[PDB]
Amino acid sequence: RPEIKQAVTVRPGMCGPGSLFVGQLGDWTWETVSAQCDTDVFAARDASGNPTYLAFYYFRVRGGRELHPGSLTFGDRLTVTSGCYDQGTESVLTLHRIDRAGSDDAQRPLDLHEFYERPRDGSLYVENFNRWVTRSAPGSNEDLVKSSPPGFRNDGLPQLPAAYSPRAVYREARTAHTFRALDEPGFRLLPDTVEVEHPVDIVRDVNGVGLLYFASYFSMVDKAALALWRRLGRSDRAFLRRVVVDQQMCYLGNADLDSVLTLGARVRVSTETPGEELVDVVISDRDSGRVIAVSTLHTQHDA
Amino acid sequence: RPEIKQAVTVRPGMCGPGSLFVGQLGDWTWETVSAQCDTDVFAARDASGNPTYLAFYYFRVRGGRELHPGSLTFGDRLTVTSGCYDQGTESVLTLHRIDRAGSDDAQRPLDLHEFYERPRDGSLYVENFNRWVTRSAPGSNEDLVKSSPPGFRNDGLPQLPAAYSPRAVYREARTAHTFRALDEPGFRLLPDTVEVEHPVDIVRDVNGVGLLYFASYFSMVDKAALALWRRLGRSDRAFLRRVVVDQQMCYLGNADLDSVLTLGARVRVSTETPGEELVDVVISDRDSGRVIAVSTLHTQHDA
Numbered sequence: 001r002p003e004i005k006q007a008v009t010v011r012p013g014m015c016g017p018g019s020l021f022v023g024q025l026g027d028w029t030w031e032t033v034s035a036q037c038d039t040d041v042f043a044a045r046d047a048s049g050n051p052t053y054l055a056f057y058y059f060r061v062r063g064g065r066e067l068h069p070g071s072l073t074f075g076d077r078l079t080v081t082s083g084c085y086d087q088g089t090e091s092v093l094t095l096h097r098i099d100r101a102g103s104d105d106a107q108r109p110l111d112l113h114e115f116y117e118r119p120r121d122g123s124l125y126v127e128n129f130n131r132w133v134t135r136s137a138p139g140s141n142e143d144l145v146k147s148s149p150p151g152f153r154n155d156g157l158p159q160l161p162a163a164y165s166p167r168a169v170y171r172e173a174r175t176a177h178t179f180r181a182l183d184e185p186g187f188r189l190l191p192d193t194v195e196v197e198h199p200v201d202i203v204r205d206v207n208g209v210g211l212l213y214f215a216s217y218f219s220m221v222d223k224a225a226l227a228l229w230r231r232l233g234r235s236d237r238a239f240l241r242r243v244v245v246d247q248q249m250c251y252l253g254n255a256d257l258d259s260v261l262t263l264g265a266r267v268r269v270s271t272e273t274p275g276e277e278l279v280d281v282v283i284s285d286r287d288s289g290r291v292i293a294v295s296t297l298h299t300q301h302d303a
Numbered sequence: 304r305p306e307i308k309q310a311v312t313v314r315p316g317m318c319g320p321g322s323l324f325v326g327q328l329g330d331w332t333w334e335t336v337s338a339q340c341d342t343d344v345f346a347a348r349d350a351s352g353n354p355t356y357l358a359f360y361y362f363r364v365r366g367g368r369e370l371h372p373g374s375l376t377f378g379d380r381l382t383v384t385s386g387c388y389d390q391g392t393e394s395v396l397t398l399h400r401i402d403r404a405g406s407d408d409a410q411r412p413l414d415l416h417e418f419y420e421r422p423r424d425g426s427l428y429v430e431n432f433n434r435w436v437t438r439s440a441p442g443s444n445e446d447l448v449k450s451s452p453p454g455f456r457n458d459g460l461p462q463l464p465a466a467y468s469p470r471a472v473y474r475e476a477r478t479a480h481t482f483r484a485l486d487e488p489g490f491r492l493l494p495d496t497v498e499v500e501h502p503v504d505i506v507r508d509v510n511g512v513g514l515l516y517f518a519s520y521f522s523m524v525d526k527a528a529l530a531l532w533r534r535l536g537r538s539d540r541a542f543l544r545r546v547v548v549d550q551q552m553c554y555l556g557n558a559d560l561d562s563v564l565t566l567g568a569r570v571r572v573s574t575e576t577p578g579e580e581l582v583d584v585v586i587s588d589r590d591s592g593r594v595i596a597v598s599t600l601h602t603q604h605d606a
Contacts, residue, residue, distance in 0.1 A: 009345050013316075013330040013518075015511035020326070027316040042312050043378025053377075073511050074356075075346025202539050203525045204507060208318035208376050210543070215316075222506045236505050236561060240513070258539060 003083040010076040019215035056214035058129035064121035077101035086157040098124035129166040179248040179296035187268035224263035246298035253292035306386040313379040322518035359517035361432035367424035380404035389460040401427035432469040482551040482599035490571035527566035549601035556595035
């Protein structure tokens, strides 16, 4: 029932231009659900004793120029406020707000209106919509099955209003292959695109239960984004200076560890604000005919 | 002064076949030094206010068939015991012992004789020898300069005897390009070797202060090890089953983010124990003429 407040000192293991910060956010999600749903998410099993994993399905990190994930450096002092929202017995929404520890109203509780309608430049807003899954066959990562560990307590969580729907957001992204409608005014699509062949990296993409790791989807998206950035003649130093003010990820599937994935990327540039762009990445498993992820990044850069 | 004991539940962010477990060990090292040396290692600065980093120099993870890093899965309950040993004002040795939370004498304190002479199959032994460094020029990762933040308290730490010398161990590895002497009896060198060109991966190899991340050296070593494993006709599934009972890493240098590194690997097989091998990896920066890392892995595998 109570929200979880933490004072966090930024460590090397949770920042930088890789996926470590997203990895820390997902561990916080599993801790918060464990505390609020009276379930050990780390060791969850169904009635037959089959492991069940609280898989990532929809993920958003929204910041701004005053605080974005690239702002975070060793030793920064943060305040983290975390809580869960009822999505039934098979799914759960976890929110995290991140503020600099010394900012004005850092002690404020979670506010759905602030997350969904009035986000503040200077705070980071994280949404993790997770779904319980089991393997349909040992050693297969395809055709995962919906689950719910016995004793999972969603009854004690606060409710979302109909307006605030992670499910509607991800349904539109699966259909459009973007989280920002192509008809959104104030953008122009560049003709330059990339399609990168990515064999699953069994040293870097794989978690401790033999699935593709949710954080490595962020890595694969940035590999596609960097391929497009280089295609447009832009520098590595300039890629490391990019400000990602918003990113959304939908995880449609996992993939077997011998899969060859395809990473497709396209970009729209602002016709209003120099340096503002929307990058869309689609991750395909061509051999099974599946789109396994979609991501949109809203960025601000300086050449 | 007191050792730090922690009860740890294995999270997705600290296990699997990547470098996440090594990343968690290094964050624990920075926490333990901070607590025992009255210094905020995460935000350390010298007298002019230049950032100073407690860089990794020598790293060992020693396990065995009963507990090795590949043993760890989501939700496992561990006991971690951590403490620092005096290496003067510019360096510090941190030890971590990891036991399963329910094992017989998991509450025992750190024991140098147990770490250096009588390690137990069923416990994991970690040594981190770290050295304070500053950049010699902003944005340069070469020719780092020895440092010590003002107020660094090594005076309060226990001493190593002369017999137990991380410095002697790493000096021999820099010279031999292995931590296991080539004249060690009971091994035969295979003729198969690999040399892999690895551009620095600015999405995956780089930390939050723009240096090569200590954990990504472990990733680069496993990329070389996998290249050699495939050269010998062995399967990906078999690589994911490898038992690494001992690994040692020396970090001789860092590298600029536009560097192209070379990863060289060789292997010795046991003439006594089927499936037992010693793999040596050397990481070179050809353009600057530097060996920047050496690693040796002691492994047990099943084809």
